[PDB]
Amino acid sequence: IDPPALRAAFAGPLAEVLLSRYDQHASRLLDALHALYGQRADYASWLAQWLGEVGDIARQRPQALQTLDSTRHAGWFGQPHMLGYSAYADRFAGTLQGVAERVPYLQELGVRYLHLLPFLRARAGDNDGGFAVSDYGQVEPSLGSNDDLVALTSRLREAGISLCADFVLNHTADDHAWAQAARAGDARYLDYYHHFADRTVPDRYEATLGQVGNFTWVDDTAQWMWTTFYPYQWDLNWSNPAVFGDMALAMLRLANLGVEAFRLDSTAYLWKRIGTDCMNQSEAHTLLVALRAVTDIVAPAVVMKAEAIVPMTQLPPYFGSGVDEGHECHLAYHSTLMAAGWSALALQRGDILHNVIAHSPPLPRHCAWLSYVRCHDDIGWNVLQHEACGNAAQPPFSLRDVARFYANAVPGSYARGESFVHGTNGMAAALAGIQAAQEAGDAAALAVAVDRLVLLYAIALAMPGVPLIYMGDELAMVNDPGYRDDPHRQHEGRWLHRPAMDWQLAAQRHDAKSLSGTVYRRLRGLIRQRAALGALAADQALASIALNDPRVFALTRGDSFIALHNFSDQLLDVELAAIGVDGWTLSIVLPPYGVRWLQR
Incomplete structure (x- = not known):
């Protein structure tokens, strides 16, 4: 308790702008933390110390970033000029500095928001494509180090580009320093994870849990570790304030290195409660409100994006419910629209898209959607289960039929995807018919296929928020079956749509007669028109x-x-x-x- 004392702890030995924000947002932060940890005997002592640490990190924030903080208006990320791009740093340009050298390419396309997939230290060996994080405070050596991240974001800002980084807050790799400390017998860090002496408590939890099979015995810790995903990914114990504190600080250090957007991954599982499915609990959203409050105070130029891939009817809460609306995540992925686009295409039914948009939850003030056509993952058709049942305006449709179509398991399909209702792997160009048309040297079919690809992107580009182009789609890059020939990736079918950037193909964007140049030019046209339309801003x-x-x-x-x-x-x-x-x-x-x- 005692606000002035906490303000002083935050303030330090001796700041006007920063403190004015603290005065307006700290109360919301404090209520969130009290709701989650307020009953702990160590709460007060923990809070005072942590706020002191937050204040120090806040004051060391680079001046350039402090300037963005004090000049950016709410909802800046939802303006018409905003265009996103998602890619693996290594696949795109090998290293972080390599990505920086390719900024001119991103600037010419019109990109203002760049999402680089997991580039922080990842688990040795299997690491689920980087999502098994072993260090939130250091870049994967093969890509560079923090020094290079700083140089990258500085370069990106020179082109008006905001870097979005994944922040896997639900779990870490089982070789993360905290995990290693736990392995070494440090009770302090063992408590950063959900650990149990035996199966007694885990069994009670599992009774109401689901499978995404949620606990793993670990010799080194001599305890059962909560593992919602892979056995090598240990769920953090967010009921422990030290975990919240250190993760909040880790987020700010990343922000100070230039990260302007955070893709909060696996947020639904943040809070555990016996008797429940331990998903989308009220407390998980309270945690996001707290993290958001921290950014409103320390780094307001930053945006919080919910990674959650779920039916649009489950997304509103992420923007904050009730009294917290507008005080949680800034963005959320419109996966229903993405899957509806491909379904509508294969079935030649625009009525499915009408259904989705007509029922799309109205965006809260200063919140927006992340719209997309493809991503590093397979297409999860299940998100459309509800729509597929049809309604008074839209007859039902078969997701299994849609899946089979894109998996080319049906007689008359122009798609060349691969089954992962199971998801579908493959590049947008392969699914839209471009790959097949190229294989057959069919000029007529190729042209129609180009229209299909552009159509789906036009939809994303007209949406309120950030349209996110998946690396290579602007060049109509097709599948990469290469992974199938190396025992290290062979078991991961998603590599089919995770090709390395073809910079020679990229050079063809200048030849308006080439396929890449044609697709690029058409997408560029929509991008430019979108940039000139105020009606497309996220507040409209x-x-x-x-x-x-x-x-x-x-x-x-x-x-x-x-x-x-x-x-x-x-x-x-x-x-x-x-x-x-x-x-x-x-x-x-x-x-x-x-x-x-x-x-x-």
Whole structure:
């Protein structure tokens, strides 16, 4: 208790801007922490010490970053010029400094938000693609060190690009320094994890748990360790304030190295409670509110993004529920839209997209969506289970049929994906028909395939928030079956859509006659138009006009923008009086898989 004392601990021996923010946000932070740890005898002593540490980190934040902090307005990340890009640092340019040398390429595309997949120290051996983190405070040696991260983000800022980094807060690798200390008998760090002397308590938990099989016996610690995911990933005990404190500090150190966005991974499992499924508990959101409050005070230029890949009906809480709305995550991934796009494409049904947008939870103030077409993972069709059941406006559809189509397990498919309802692996270009058309040297089919790819991206680009291009899609890169020939990746089918960047192919973006140049040019056109449309800013409404033709999808933004999509293989038109329009293009005829943008 005693706010002035805590403020002084935070303040240090002797700051106006930083302290003004503390005065406005610290109370929310304190209530969150008290709700979670307030009953502990060590709470007060822990809090005072931690705030002192936070204050020191805050004051050492680079001036350039402090400037972004005090000049960025809320919702900056949702403006029209914002365009994202996701890639593995090694696959894209080998190293961090290599990524920095490729910034001109990112700047020409129009990128302002770059997500580099797990680049922090990862577990030796298997590490689930870097998600088994062994050190939150140091870069994977093969990519460089903190010095290079700093140089990278400085270079990125020179192009107006914000770096997004994964922050795996639910668990660490079993070789993380904390885990090694636990292995060595340090009771202090053993307590950073959920450990049990025997199966008694774990059995009680498991009774209501699910399988994603949640506990692993470890010889070195002589205890059962909570392991929701891989046996080598130990779940942190967030009921321990020291864990929250050290992770919060680790987040700020990363922010001080230039990280401007944090993809909070596996946040649903942050809080455990006997009797529950230990998922999406109230406390897990309280933890995110706390972390968000810390950033509002120390580094407000930063954004918090929920990684959670779930049905859009489960996303609102992440933006903060009730009194906390607007005080939790800034962004969330619209996975329902992503899967609906591919489903709509394979079934030639725009009505599925109408269903998704018409029911898309309205974004809270200063919050936005992360829209995308593909990512480093397989397409998880299950997120559409609800929609697939159909409703009064949209008849049901088969997810199994959609999966089979993209896995080319059906007679007439132009897709070349691979089954992982099981997910689907493969590059956007492979799924859209581009790979198949290229294999057959079919010019006609290639052109249609290019339209399909552009169509799905146009949808993401019209969304409120950050449209995230997956590395290589702008060049229509196809699958990389190469992983199939080396015993180290062979067992991981997702490598099929995790190719290394082809910089020679990238050089072809200049030849408007090449496939890559054609795809690149078309995507660039949409990107530029999006950048000029204020109606597309995240604070503007997002809706969908119900049309009487199931093949078409109409997406509206604000009250002056309308995007029309034809998800069928046939030419058709949409009557102006059916969408109450008669404006400017940026009835209306829509070619197969065509998209049209209009404004007042």
